[PDB]
């Protein structure tokens, strides 16, 4: 999944 800070 996407990183904590990805949009």
């Amino acid at each position, epitope marked *: 999944e*996407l990183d904590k*800070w*990805a949009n």
Partner: antibody, heavy 132, light 108 residues
Framework: RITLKESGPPLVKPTQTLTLTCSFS??????????VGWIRQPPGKALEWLAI???????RYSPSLNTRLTITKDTSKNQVVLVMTRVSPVDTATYFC????????????????????????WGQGITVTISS | ALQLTQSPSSLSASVGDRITITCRASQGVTSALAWYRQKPGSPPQLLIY???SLESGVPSRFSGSGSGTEFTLTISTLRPEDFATYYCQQLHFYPHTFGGGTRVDVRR
């Protein structure tokens, strides 16, 4: 100045449980968006990402090791603990914990996320050997 | 998962050379990429964060560029302390992958 240091047993036997502690100073795991992660390096091999935990307590793990890892924090002691169960010889490696910055804030308003894209300060690393 | 391939895996050079190491991702990672230098017996040290920002206290001969799937680290004037292994790390997708590393050694 941020510094981190790993501690735990240098030797562990197969099937046993390995508990590693990262004690740090210079930041608090209650600071906004901060993270502390764990990375390992078997001798002569590449770095391998293991897990990370943030101050709001979100946790993420390597999918390949998910079932054997638990990461937790103790904010008041400035420590992050990583517990790996059922170790085997391939788990022998140098284990590092590292700091991850949270977004820059201006008057407590997040304005820059570029600083979160790196693990900026690392501990010296602790060598762990798994053998019976 | 996401793959990060470094090139070349090994590279020979001499003090004063300009070298460039590249890292390619299997899917786009935007600008969430970091470069590190690791000397034997020591932990990796952050050189460049967010694909191109120079980390504080890191010498200016180090430079990083690129975004998406292709990134490059260039050291403009190699110094003796640069004979080491370099790694790139992606932080856009979990798990936060590392490349295989590129060893930079004394050419002869």
């Amino acid at each position: 100045r941020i510094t981190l240091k790993e501690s735990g047993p240098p030797l562990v036997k197969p099937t046993q449980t390995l508990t590693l502690t990262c004690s740090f100073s210079g930041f608090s795991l209650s600071d906004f968006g901060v993270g502390v992660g764990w990375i390992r390096q078997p001798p002569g091999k590449a770095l391998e990402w293991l897990a990370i935990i943030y101050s709001d307590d979100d946790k993420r793990y390597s999918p390949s090791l998910n079932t054997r890892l638990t990461i937790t924090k103790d904010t008041s002691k400035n420590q992050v603990v990583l517990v790996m169960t059922r170790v085997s010889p391939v788990d022998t490696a140098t284990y590092f914990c590292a700091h991850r910055r949270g977004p820059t804030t201006l008057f407590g308003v997040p304005i820059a996320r570029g600083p979160v894209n790196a693990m900026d300060v690392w501990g010296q690393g602790i060598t762990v050997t798994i053998s019976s | 998962a996401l793959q990060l391939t470094q090139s070349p895996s090994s590279l020979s050079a001499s003090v004063g050379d300009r070298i460039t190491i590249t890292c390619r991702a299997s899917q786009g990672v935007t600008s969430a990429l970091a470069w590190y230098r690791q000397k034997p017996g020591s932990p990796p040290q952050l050189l460049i964060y967010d694909a191109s920002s120079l980390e504080s206290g890191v010498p200016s001969r180090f430079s990083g560029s690129g975004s998406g799937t292709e990134f490059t680290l260039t050291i403009s004037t190699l110094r003796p302390e640069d004979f080491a292994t370099y790694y790139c790390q992606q932080l856009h997708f979990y798990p936060h992958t590392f490349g295989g590393g590129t060893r930079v050694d004394v050419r002869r």
